[PDB]
């Protein structure tokens with residue numbers, strides 16, 4: 001009654017950048033409210049129109065684990081004290097953040113804090129931020145997990161049992177980090193299941209898990225639901241093969257992250273009907289997966305209404321980071337920029353917009369304020385958005401944004417972006433040796449990628465001539481596509497931006513970075 005419910009709905013690798021042509025040529029599309037004219041997302045568009053659209057939402061680290069970490073903590077990913085992260089980055093060494101950060105079992109996170117405030121907390125979908133040591137055991141199918149062949153048939157009773165068993169372990173482990181419920185979970189991505197048949201997205205499976213959570217909330221108790229999609233992450237649902245979409249709408253709805261099960265999803269359209277509707281509206285059939293999702297969000301809104309809690313629920317729709325033009329795990333705009341809308345009938349006026357710089361670190365301090373939490377242990381980097389949400393604040397709430405990905409750090413203002421890349425000791429030694437780096441599919445390279453992941457580095461560098469430039473300065477008014485390095489043309493401005501970067505770097509104890517902070 002006094003505390004609003006929060007439903008946080010997150011897609012995976014979905015830029016806000018619209019694709020202004022009928023064939024998207026291997027790119028994701030954003031929602032209709034982001035300006036894509038080729039999609040059909042009416043429920044989500046109406047939620048956005050009847051709430052607040054943020055046109056300059058960013059993430060501090062544009063790669064899955066790091067973005068998710070920040071979302072659920074309010075802190076920069078470079079502050080993680082996760083077990084794997086600290087083994088890679090002992091005190092006194094620079095950090096190289098990628099998919100290697102996790103929630104710490106004895107530190108604050110949003111879910112733990114909301115539980116202390118009296119919220120029932122629920123988790124559905126993709127994690128990527130819990131127990132990376134256990135993730136390694138999942139990938140290798142080591143105890144406590146059970147093993148199966150990559151080509152195994154999940155209808156096979158012994159195989160189905162193994163995959164179900166592995167899914168139950170993650171449900172239990174996720175609830176050690178502040179959740180009262182966890183179901184429809186993925187430890188990481190579809191890849192890490194190592195099974196061809198279940199290497200498919202399943203909107204319905206996770207949606208039913210979400211609705212089951214909402215059903216079990218007592219009507220007078222506040223709740224928080226973290227609803228984390230796999231879509232449209234690789235293998236992308238839009239991939240057309242033999243006239244079909246085998247990773248999305250034409251996959252078997254019986255295959256899911258827990259194996260095989262014939263569940264009743266008749267409260268959603270059939271997958272065929274989804275495709276039929278998009279084709280009838282002369283919208284892009286490759287991206288019918290967005291309408292598939294729209295209906296799932298529609299079922300959530302229907303359930304909230306039926307329970308009489310819709311008007312006092314804050315629904316957030318966003319993505320963890322972009323992947324436009326292979327700019328995932330870079331500090332270019334196709335990684336940083338994400339869709340963001342917020343809908344809350346009793347707290348946000350409709351037809352609202354905010355164009356100031358906001359960041360994923362802002363979600364936790366915002367929700368904490370709405371939940372009446374005033375005492376936290378771990379310092380928060382983000383800012384509460386509640387004055388923006390209430391329509392009181394129409395100015396910028398910060399002078400600049402900070403970013404970090406692997407060997408790269410960056411800052412941006414409204415009009416300028418600065419990126420610095422500085423090498424770890426191991427990379428620097430290979431560079432000194434004159435030997436090339438062993439690359440993805442034999443694409444060896446002279447200089448390090450920002451990240452250790454050679455697949456991401458290969459794709460991020462392939463059509464980006466400036467990728468390896470150690471100092472990059474872009475004017476966002478004369479060069480929105482970031483094709484012209486002004487570092488040597490505007491040295492005074494570069495120095496001004498370096499000051500802003502240093503102000504953020506010095507807040508990470510025992511973390512050097514090139515000549516900014518010496519080892």
Ligand SMILES: [Mg+2]
Nearest residue numbers: 012013064320
């Ligand atoms: Mg992602």
